Design an enzyme around this catalytic site. Structure first.
Site, mmCIF file in Angstrom:
data_model
loop_
_atom_site.group_PDB
_atom_site.id
_atom_site.type_symbol
_atom_site.label_atom_id
_atom_site.label_comp_id
_atom_site.label_asym_id
_atom_site.label_seq_id
_atom_site.Cartn_x
_atom_site.Cartn_y
_atom_site.Cartn_z
ATOM 1 N N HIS A 161 6.086 -1.052 3.404
ATOM 2 C CA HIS A 161 6.313 -2.220 3.857
ATOM 3 C C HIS A 161 5.329 -3.279 2.967
ATOM 4 O O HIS A 161 4.243 -2.959 2.398
ATOM 5 C CB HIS A 161 5.534 -2.392 5.256
ATOM 6 C CG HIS A 161 4.384 -1.745 5.388
ATOM 7 N ND1 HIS A 161 4.318 -0.496 6.025
ATOM 8 C CD2 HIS A 161 2.958 -2.022 5.108
ATOM 9 C CE1 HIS A 161 3.030 -0.015 6.444
ATOM 10 N NE2 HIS A 161 2.280 -1.149 5.905
ATOM 11 N N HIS A 210 3.286 -6.569 2.369
ATOM 12 C CA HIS A 210 2.461 -7.500 3.179
ATOM 13 C C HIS A 210 2.707 -8.868 2.489
ATOM 14 O O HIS A 210 2.797 -9.379 1.432
ATOM 15 C CB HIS A 210 0.891 -7.360 3.198
ATOM 16 C CG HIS A 210 0.447 -6.175 3.964
ATOM 17 N ND1 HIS A 210 -0.633 -5.437 4.136
ATOM 18 C CD2 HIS A 210 1.255 -5.334 4.960
ATOM 19 C CE1 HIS A 210 -0.803 -4.672 4.845
ATOM 20 N NE2 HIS A 210 0.380 -4.400 5.641
ATOM 21 N N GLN A 254 0.711 -1.029 0.008
ATOM 22 C CA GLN A 254 0.151 0.001 0.012
ATOM 23 C C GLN A 254 1.062 1.240 0.045
ATOM 24 O O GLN A 254 1.545 1.803 1.025
ATOM 25 C CB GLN A 254 -0.772 -0.061 1.145
ATOM 26 C CG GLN A 254 -1.424 -1.371 1.787
ATOM 27 C CD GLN A 254 -2.588 -1.441 2.647
ATOM 28 O OE1 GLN A 254 -3.519 -2.054 2.437
ATOM 29 N NE2 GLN A 254 -2.408 -0.626 3.769
ATOM 30 N N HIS A 292 5.928 3.897 6.450
ATOM 31 C CA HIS A 292 6.902 3.137 6.170
ATOM 32 C C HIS A 292 6.683 2.097 4.896
ATOM 33 O O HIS A 292 5.765 1.426 5.127
ATOM 34 C CB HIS A 292 7.361 2.364 7.305
ATOM 35 C CG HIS A 292 8.772 1.861 7.354
ATOM 36 N ND1 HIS A 292 9.871 2.116 8.266
ATOM 37 C CD2 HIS A 292 9.281 1.029 6.393
ATOM 38 C CE1 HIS A 292 10.989 1.410 8.002
ATOM 39 N NE2 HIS A 292 10.671 1.214 6.884
#
Lengths: 125, 125
Positions: free
Chosen positions: B95, B97, B82, B93
């Site tokens: 990231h 998933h 996202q 931050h």
């Protein structure tokens, strides 16, 4: 001259081709600028990819992402890889989905597709 | 000693730490084995990442993916980033998933989290 799983895809639709990866315009976008990046080698699962193919895939996905974010005036992006059946994969080729995203946002002609491509192709020149 | 946006995360929860990236167990998994990989440097957008950080992030995401697929008996995986607000980002931050996926599949204690970690940590040894 490009292959995405079973389908063979026409160059004049592919808007970037790197040393090991390539991007193409979707022939059924969810949101405008829904493009997809995938490795040149026809692997079916993220893990079959070599380390370099991986690095090239996502680097190219960084660029492609930026570009379609600019051109389709999305404020942000959404990346998503459906790795294998049960994930949601349909065509069996590693591919990253790229979606330019705007606020409150919740086939196509092979001449229109080729347009949206040449249009994008301009940013990588 | 690790930072994920505003939050500082405890080593004994981080189950892999590479040269530029690190992975951690989620403290609110959607599906068991919902882990997340993120770069050590606290950037907020995929594009602020250097080319190497990108290559390291997704290489590590390949490994981490395989491992949690094995350990949580998922048949396949689902990756999703996202990128920025409007994409769905909450903590600022980069990231990735990672979700181990099975068929028809549609907080937590800081001692339980640390368990699921040491458990995973075993596969990278």
């Amino acid at each position: 001259s490009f292959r995405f799983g079973q389908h063979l895809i026409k160059p004049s639709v592919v808007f970037l081709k790197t040393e090991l990866s390539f991007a193409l315009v979707n022939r059924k976008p969810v949101v405008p600028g829904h493009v997809l990046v995938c490795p040149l080698r026809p692997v079916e699962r993220f893990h079959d990819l070599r380390p370099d193919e991986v690095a090239d895939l996502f680097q190219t996905t960084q660029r492609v992402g930026t570009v379609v974010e600019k051109h389709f005036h999305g404020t942000s992006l959404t990346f998503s890889m459906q790795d294998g059946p049960e994930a949601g994969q349909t065509v069996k080729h590693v591919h990253v989905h790229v979606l330019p995203r705007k606020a409150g946002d919740f086939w196509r002609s092979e001449e229109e597709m080729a347009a949206e491509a040449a249009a994008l192709r301009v940013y990588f020149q």
